Structures are given as C-alpha cells and as structure tokens.
Design a protein around this ligand. Structure first.
Ligand SMILES: [Mg+2]
Ligand SMILES: [Mg+2]
Ligand SMILES: [Mg+2]
Ligand SMILES: [Mg+2]
Ligand SMILES: [Mg+2]
Ligand SMILES: [Mg+2]
Ligand SMILES: [Mg+2]
Ligand SMILES: [Mg+2]
Ligand SMILES: [Mg+2]
Ligand SMILES: [Mg+2]
Ligand SMILES: [Mg+2]
Ligand SMILES: [Mg+2]
Ligand SMILES: [Mg+2]
Lengths: 55, 143, 141, 106, 58, 78, 145, 117
RNA sequence: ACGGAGCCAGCGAGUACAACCUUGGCCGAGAGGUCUGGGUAAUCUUGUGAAACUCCGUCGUGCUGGGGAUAGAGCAUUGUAAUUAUUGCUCUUCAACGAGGAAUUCCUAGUAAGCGCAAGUCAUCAGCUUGCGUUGAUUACGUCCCUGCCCUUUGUACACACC
C-alpha cells in the first residue's frame, strides 16, 4: 500500500467518481439538481424530499 | 406612397438586391469562395457557383433590417438545415461561421451594417435607406 | 381617443393578437401587409374573413396583427381567427348590434372555427409508447 | 436619519401555496398599513421540478415509469418604502416552508 | 452561499431526509414520531416529536 | 441489381436539328404541354425538356397557365 | 436558350486518364465516374478550369479536357487548398498528393500490404478480411455477399 | 525503394529528436505529446537506451518487458525488442523503422483469433 | 435528392468550493480555437430564427446527383490515458438495397404517421428512453369469427385443476 500507488487512479469524473449518498453505489444514480441519490432510494424518500406522484 | 422592405415579398427582394450588389463592383467576395460548403450540413457548394455570396449578403442585410440586431453565431443557427448523418438520424447543424463573418464585415465596409452597442450588428441609416430604395425598385418593377 | 379594441385568436400553440382601429383600410400582419402571408397556399384562408364579409365593410378600419407561437399553418389560422374576432368585437363595441349579428351569420355559416377557438390539442405521451396513444412492438417469442 | 428610500425588494419561494400566498398577503397588508408604495405580488411561472424514474428496482417486469415533481412559486415583491418598517416586516411573519429573501437594490 | 433556487429547495428536502433518517436510526428506542425543520432569519429550529421526550432530552 | 428492365438510352441527351424541327412543328397541336408530356415522345432527355419548354416562351408559341416549380402547365397559343 | 449543338462534333465516349467515360452526363458527374474523384472534387476542378458547370461532358472541347486533366494531377499548383485533397501528408514522403484512378487503388494496396507486413492489429484484421474500425461483428457482416 | 517517413529518410530517422518527429507526427500524436507526458514513457526510454547500449553491437538486443501500451514508438526506439503485455504474455515485438507513428498495442493482440468448426 | 431563399414552437436545463449554459467580437473551410460579456435564471444562452415545410432553380427513371455501409489519408475536441477506429470535421471508394415469403406488431382524433428539440445516461459518445411541440390523415363508431376477459347455466373420472 505504497501511498504513490494505493488509490492512485484519478477519480475526477466517470461512473465511479460520485456515489449514492444513500448506499454508496455507483449504478442507477440520479444527478438531477444535485440529488446524487440512486433511483430506488429516491423512490423511497421522494415524499420526504418533496417529490410526489401527481399525474 | 412610402415603402419598406416589409411591404415587398421576400424572395424577390433578396433576388433583386443580390443582382444590384453583383452589378456594382463593391462588396468584395472573399478569395476562398467557390471552395466552401457554406455549412457542415451541406454536402456540395452552391449550385450558382459565382454570385451566391451576393445573395447571401442580400438575405443577411434584409434579416438585420427586420430583426433587432444579429451577430454571427446567430446567423449560423439561422442558415444550415439537417445534415444527412449517413445512417444516423438527421439533426440540426449550424452553418459555417467564416462565411457569415465575412458577409458581416463586407456589409460593414459598404456601410449598410453598424456595430450595435448591445452586441451583434444592427442596420445603419445609409444601408437602411438603400434597402428601402431597392424595395421600392422591386415594388414598382412588379407593376 | 381613437375608437380601438384588441382581440386575439388561437390555434394549437399559435396566438395572433389583433388591434383594430378606425383607420384607412390597413391590414398588416407582423408589420407586413396581409397579401404576403408566407405559406402562400393558405393565403386565401387569411383573406377568408375579408371576402366573406366584403372589404367595403371595413374600408376605414385598420388592422394590426402580431402572430407568435405554433407552426406556419397554426399561425395562419390564428390570424384568421384574430381578424374575424376583431371585426366582430369592434362592430359590437362601436358600430351596431345588427351589423355584428350579420357578420356572425356570415362567419359561423362558414368554417365555425372563424369565431370559435379550436378545442383539439395534443394528447400527452405515455411510457411504453413512442406516441401519445401508440405502443412498442411485442416480441412474443 | 434613514429617510433615503432603499427601493427594496422582497422575493419568496416555496413548494406549497396557501402559506406562501398567506405570507404575501400579510406582507402587502403590512405595506399598506404604514402607507407604502409597492408593486404587487407579481406571480412567477411555477417551476415544475420533475424526475422520471423506473419503478422496478431490478429491470424485470413490464416497462413502467413514474414522474415525481414539485412546483416552486416565487411571487416577488418590491417596495419604494422607508427603511426600518420594511426590515421589521421582513423579520416578522415567517412561515416554515415559504422562504423569504430580501434584496436592498439601493 | 449562492446557489440556484430550485437546487436550494432540493437540497433543503434532502437535508430534511438526512435529519429524518438519522433521527430514526438514533431515537428509535425513544418512540420517534416525526421531525419538523423551521427556518428563521437567524436560527434553524429543529422540533423533534417523539414519545419519550424526557429521555430524549436526557 | 437485377437488370430485367432492359431499358435503352431512350432519351435525346443532346438536341439535333431534325429534332429541332420536330419540337417546333408540334410545338402547337400539343394542346397540353409539360416536361413529362415533352419527354413522353422520346425526343427529349428531360433536362433539356425544361430548356425547350422555357425557350417556347419566346414568341408566345404556348401560353402559361401556372409556372409553379417542380412542373409546368402550358397550353397552345390561340 | 437552346442550340442545335453542331451535329457531328458532340462526343459520346471519352478516355480521360485511361478510363472510358460516357460524355452525355453533366461534366462533373461524368468526371465522377473515375476512381478517386467524387462529386465535390470534380465540381471544384471543373470550377477552377472555367468550363461551364451545366455543360455536357461530350460537348466540351479537347484543350478543355487537357486543362481539366492538368488541373487534377498537381492540384496545389492551381490554388486547390492543402485540405480538400485525397491523400494529405502522404506518409511515404510527406507531400500531400491526390490519388487517381489506377494510382488510388494501387497505393491503397501498398498501404494495405504495409499494414500486413507491419504486423499491426489493423493490418492483420485487414489480412483476415474482418471489420477493422472497431464495430461489433456478432450480428453484422453475417454473409460475405 | 528505401524507407522515408514523411520525407525524413531512414538515415535521418535513426539520428533525430522526438520533437522534430512530433512536428512530423500526425494530429493524434501531436496532441498527445503536446498534452504533456507521463514519467513511465521516460523510464521506458531510459531502460531501452540502456538495453541497446548493453547489446554487443551484432545481435538482437535483450527483450524489455513492459505493460505500457498507450505510448507511441518514437524515432529513438527503432532497433529495440519489447515485450508488450497482452493480458497474459509479454508478446515479443522487434521495433522496425515502420513501427513509428503507431502505439505498442497494435502488436500485442489482446484477443486470440476465433476459429469456428 | 441536391443548391440557394423563406423562417415557425413547446416541454427543459444551466457554474462553489467549482469550473455549467453560452451570447457577442476576432481567427479557421469545418470540427474547433481565442478575447471579452451576461446568467445561481420569465432577466442571460433564448423569440432555443429546430427539422419536416414553403418558393425559385439543377438533376430526369439511369442502382442515377438515391442509398452511405465498408475502407484510405489528414485536421481537431474530451480524457492520465482514444490502438480494438471515443466523438466531430475535410477529400475519395462508393457495397447490399428494385416496396421484401410464411408470419407477425401498434393504432379510431390533434390519434396513427412523418419531423425534430429538450431532459436522464454525460469528462467525450447515441441510432435509447422519458417528455415536448410542428405538419397531420385513410378507415371504423361494429362483432364474437381468431386470441382472450366478465357473469350465469350445465357436465366432469380434473384439484400439482386440460400443460
Ligand atoms: Mg436553409
Ligand atoms: Mg434522406
Ligand atoms: Mg407520434
Ligand atoms: Mg430544401
Ligand atoms: Mg419558444
Ligand atoms: Mg432552422
Ligand atoms: Mg451513387
Ligand atoms: Mg445523395
Ligand atoms: Mg425522414
Ligand atoms: Mg439504455
Ligand atoms: Mg369498440
Ligand atoms: Mg384427485
Ligand atoms: Mg391432452
């Protein structure tokens, strides 16, 4: 785990640059308006957030 | 009585104004004409190999007269249609920027287009007078 | 002040606002005279109120129409409605009742949309279909 | 010695209506109570914040989506009004949900 | 702090979700019911509605 | 691909003198004239169909009814 | 507007750069029928030679053919830009050329056998006859014909 | 005919700097080298010059194994034997004068050819 | 189809502890580059001057100026990194394709269909999806014939229920 090599790969962008903020997962993320919550957790917490099914 | 370019059909006005600008020796054409697509969307140069630049200048001058003021990239959005992207769906492709820039500078030299404070270019009093004069020329040409 | 009113006419997403004044028989759309409506094959559509009523009905009336939104033919129908409704509203406001009812009889007996805005408008799309009411293909095997 | 009018501006936000409209109405009533000149609670187009989301967490099942949304209403107000009464108005009559912001613009 | 108003409201909602889930994790033994986030010009009051109020206070 | 059409040149790509007297002789007596009508008689390729059709508006050999693009509608001068 | 076009001089077949070309097509689209020349390049070449665009290839005169041919073999002499050329920067000698009927296919073949000898993955893919530009081949090109 | 790259002959090709080749190089290599370089290609350069020096002047120099596939073959490289990582094997490749302009990856086929039937 | 000219929307989205939407002015033929200026948004991009469409011409039934796949060379952009072509642009080769068998899918009014734009994926990449609008119809306004569904009556040796 030489600090020069450990976790040395850049992560400024791409699929794995950002996480779920709920689950830490990199799949099915919602980046709209900086929500950064994946889709399923968004469906779970939408009403608390302020999002409602309306039409 | 009085007549403005709004009182004349468009296509006839562009045709006559292009003819008048071609007749007089002013409005120098860039040396790179005859070689240019005029847009990335297009796939051939204009069919009218010489004189099409005069028509483009005529249309541009009419457009600046009609609108508030227009820059170059906005003309790029205006001209240029759909590119046949091979086997992909067509999209909108902006026209060539150099051609419209050269049109705008040439119209500046003729004095028909003035740099506007709000950005872009608007019409000038001398050029607008010329525009209505040629509109009258076309209108009394019709009958 | 000059007797003047403002009316409007709509299509799917088109909207023509027409100001009618006691003028000299002056009909402009977007600052251009009516004879140069662009699609040039629906031009008779926009003369329709003129010829149905007769130009002499409004010879000292001037027309100014600003039409925005919607595609070409939607704009054209918007101007049609704007001109017709402006004529009717002006006649009601400042001319007489009988003239207005005569105009309405001449109009509504021909293309009822001339005074009544169309109610048909696009249907929202739905998931599972590339159209508003269409659907995707099924595999089945 | 604050006689200089600040031509101040009060703008609002919310995800709900009745409390936002109530706050705006109280603001206007306060403004008229002390003889202030104003431009009314001008309505702004409710911005619809929309997300489409697939319902199924695992891709299996017939393709079913849903759309969640809020609406944000703004209703900004500006006053050609004195100093202290305006600030007192902004610092009073605050309802959770509706967010008040004040711009001096002087 | 300058940010788009729609993004500001979305952040406020996700912060409320933050608080609600965190309090659900923590005060579960307290018979947690709900949380309200009131924002004043100066203080961000956070009212906790729970059953065992005196134990929540500690 | 499948050349079962077996078509020939079948079109006068360049106008010849005798064909010029032909176009002029039945410039009238063709009571309706158009580009397709002109090429129907094997005597015009189709690009010069427009050329001959436009030239006939020289001494009023035929009269125009409508001069819309993509076609033409011409009748005999009477 | 129209001309009898001097019966007895309008050519019907031509041999420009050792390929037969039918002359009755429009000049540019008649020139297009030679390998390495397309509608854009032929259009520009005809434009530079001052010959009428709407003219037919079978009616233009002989020295017109020779001037056109000379123009489209050393293009950079006649103000044809560095771009717009067929083979630019020419990785054998660095001089932007324009390949023509036999030269185009021949030089493409030397480049192909260079890529074969170079043992590049692109070259071995060309040698095998498979797709080169990195597209999926599970479902495409599924018969040779 | 003898080898020239872009009018720069083979004789000039062996004795010539990287930067002049960049000027001769196509657009992709021009951007790559103009975008800055990693330390790993420099170390590869040093190791390869050492390997070329060590060889007794008459046989194929010792193969230098390397994982680097993303760097290109510069004019200082010809005369070299490198084993490019293939995923499994440091596949051998001797660097010909025609190597230049390309990368290394084209000569280490990461996938075995597929044979049906 | 290709040239010019006309010039028309509605959903959106957009930068802070980061570097987003980009106008405008200069360059370049283009992609693009550079210098400045707006916009944390009914304010600026934006009237998103979008395509289809319209007018005037070139083409003229020729796998042809249709079709643009497969390749060769070059120029740029994002990227630590682009070869197994990221993507965009310029020149060229231009293949199969002649309205597609059995069979089978969707759909009754601003609907189908054509046309594009926005948003989600996004450092770069859509031929995808979710939405939006433009032009906008033919044919029904019925039936249980095929495929099924609901209720009732009947028969059953079926109940893992006609697989
Ligand atoms: Mg156009
Ligand atoms: Mg097409
Ligand atoms: Mg549809
Ligand atoms: Mg067109
Ligand atoms: Mg709009
Ligand atoms: Mg457009
Ligand atoms: Mg072809
Ligand atoms: Mg084509
Ligand atoms: Mg289409
Ligand atoms: Mg997908
Ligand atoms: Mg039914
Ligand atoms: Mg049993
Ligand atoms: Mg059985």
């Amino acid at each position: 785990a030489h600090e020069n090599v450990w976790y040395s790969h850049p992560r400024k962008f791409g699929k794995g640059s950002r996480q779920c903020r709920i689950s830490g997962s990199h799949s099915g993320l919602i980046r709209k308006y900086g929500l950064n919550i994946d889709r399923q957790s968004f469906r779970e917490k939408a009403n608390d957030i302020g999002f409602y099914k309306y039409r | 009585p009085g007549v403005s370019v709004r009182d004349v059909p468009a296509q006839d006005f562009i045709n006559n104004y292009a003819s008048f600008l071609q007749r007089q020796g002013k409005l120098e054409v860039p040396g790179y004409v005859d070689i240019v697509k005029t847009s990335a969307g297009n796939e051939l140069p204009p069919q009218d190999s010489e004189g099409w630049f005069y028509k483009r200048a005529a249309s541009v001058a009419r457009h600046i007269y009609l609108r508030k003021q227009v820059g170059v990239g906005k003309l790029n959005k205006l001209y240029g249609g759909a590119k046949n992207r091979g086997v992909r769906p067509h999209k909108h492709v902006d026209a060539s920027g150099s051609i419209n820039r050269k049109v705008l500078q040439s119209l500046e030299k003729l004095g028909v287009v003035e740099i506007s404070p709000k950005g872009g270019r608007r019409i000038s009093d001398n050029g607008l007078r010329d525009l209505d004069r040629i509109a009258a020329a076309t209108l009394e040409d019709e009958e | 002040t000059v007797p003047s009113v403002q009316t409007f006419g709509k299509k799917k997403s088109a909207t023509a606002v027409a100001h009618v004044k006691a003028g000299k028989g002056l009909i402009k759309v977007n600052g251009s005279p009516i004879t140069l409506v662009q699609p040039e094959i629906l031009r008779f559509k926009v003369y329709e109120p003129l010829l149905l009523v007769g130009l002499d009905k409004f010879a000292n009336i001037d027309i100014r129409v600003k039409v925005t939104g919607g595609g070409h033919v939607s704009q054209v129908y918007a101007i049609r409605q704007a001109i017709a409704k402006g004529l009717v509203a002006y006649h009601q406001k400042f001319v007489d009742e009988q003239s207005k009812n005569e105009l309405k009889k001449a109009f509504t007996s021909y293309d009822r949309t001339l005074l009544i805005a169309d109610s048909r408008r696009p249907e929202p799309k739905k998931f599972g279909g590339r159209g508003a009411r269409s659907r995707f293909q099924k595999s089945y095997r | 010695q604050e006689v200089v009018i600040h031509k101040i501006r009060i703008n609002l936000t919310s995800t709900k209506v009745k409390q936002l409209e109530n706050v705006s109405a109280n603001i206007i009533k306060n403004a008229e109570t002390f003889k202030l000149v104003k431009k009314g609670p001008v309505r702004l187009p409710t911005k619809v914040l929309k997300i489409s989301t697939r319902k199924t967490p695992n891709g299996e099942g017939s393709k079913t989506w849903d759309t969640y949304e809020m609406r944000i209403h703004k209703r900004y107000i500006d006053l050609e009004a004195p100093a202290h009464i305006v600030k007192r108005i902004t610092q009073i009559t605050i309802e959770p949900g509706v967010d008040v912001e004040v711009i001096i613009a002087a | 702090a300058i940010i788009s108003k729609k993004r500001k409201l979305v952040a406020d909602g996700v912060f409320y979700a933050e608080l609600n889930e965190f309090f659900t994790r923590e005060l579960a033994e307290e018979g947690y019911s709900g949380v309200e986030v009131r924002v004043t010009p100066t203080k961000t009051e956070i009212i906790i509605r729970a059953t065992k109020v005196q134990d929540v206070v500690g | 691909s499948k050349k079962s059409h077996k078509d020939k040149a079948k079109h006068a790509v360049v106008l010849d003198q005798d064909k010029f007297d032909r176009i002029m002789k039945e410039a009238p007596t063709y009571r309706y004239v158009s580009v397709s009508v002109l090429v129907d008689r094997f005597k015009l390729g189709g690009s010069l169909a427009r050329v001959a059709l436009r030239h006939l508006e020289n001494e009023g050999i035929i009269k125009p009814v409508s001069k819309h693009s993509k076609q033409a509608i011409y009748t005999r001068a009477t | 507007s129209l001309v009898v076009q001097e019966q007895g001089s309008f050519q019907h077949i031509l041999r420009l750069l050792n390929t037969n070309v039918d002359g009755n097509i429009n000049v540019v689209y008649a020139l297009t029928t030679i390998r390495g020349v397309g509608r854009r390049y032929a259009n520009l070449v005809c434009k530079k030679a001052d010959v009428d665009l709407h003219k037919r290839a079978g009616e233009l005169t002989q020295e017109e053919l020779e001037r056109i041919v000379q123009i489209m073999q050393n293009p950079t002499h006649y103000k044809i830009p560095a771009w717009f050329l067929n083979r630019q920067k020419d990785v054998n000698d660095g001089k932007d050329y324009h390949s023509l009927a036999n030269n185009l296919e021949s030089k493409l073949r030397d480049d192909l056998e260079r890529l074969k000898k170079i043992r590049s993955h692109r070259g071995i893919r060309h040698f095998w006859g498979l797709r080169v530009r990195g597209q999926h081949t599970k479902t495409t090109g599924r018969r040779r014909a | 005919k003898t080898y020239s790259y872009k009018g720069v002959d083979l004789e000039k090709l062996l004795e010539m700097p990287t930067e002049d080749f960049v000027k001769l190089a196509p657009a992709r290599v021009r951007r790559k080298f103009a975008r800055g370089l990693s330390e790993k290609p420099a170390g590869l350069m040093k190791k390869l010059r050492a390997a070329k020096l060590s060889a007794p002047e008459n046989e194929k120099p010792a193969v230098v194994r390397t994982h680097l596939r993303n760097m290109i073959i510069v004019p200082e490289m010809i005369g070299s034997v490198v084993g490019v990582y293939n995923g499994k094997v440091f596949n051998q490749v001797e660097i010909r004068p025609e190597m230049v302009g390309h990368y290394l990856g084209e000569f280490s086929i990461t996938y075995t050819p597929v044979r049906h039937g």
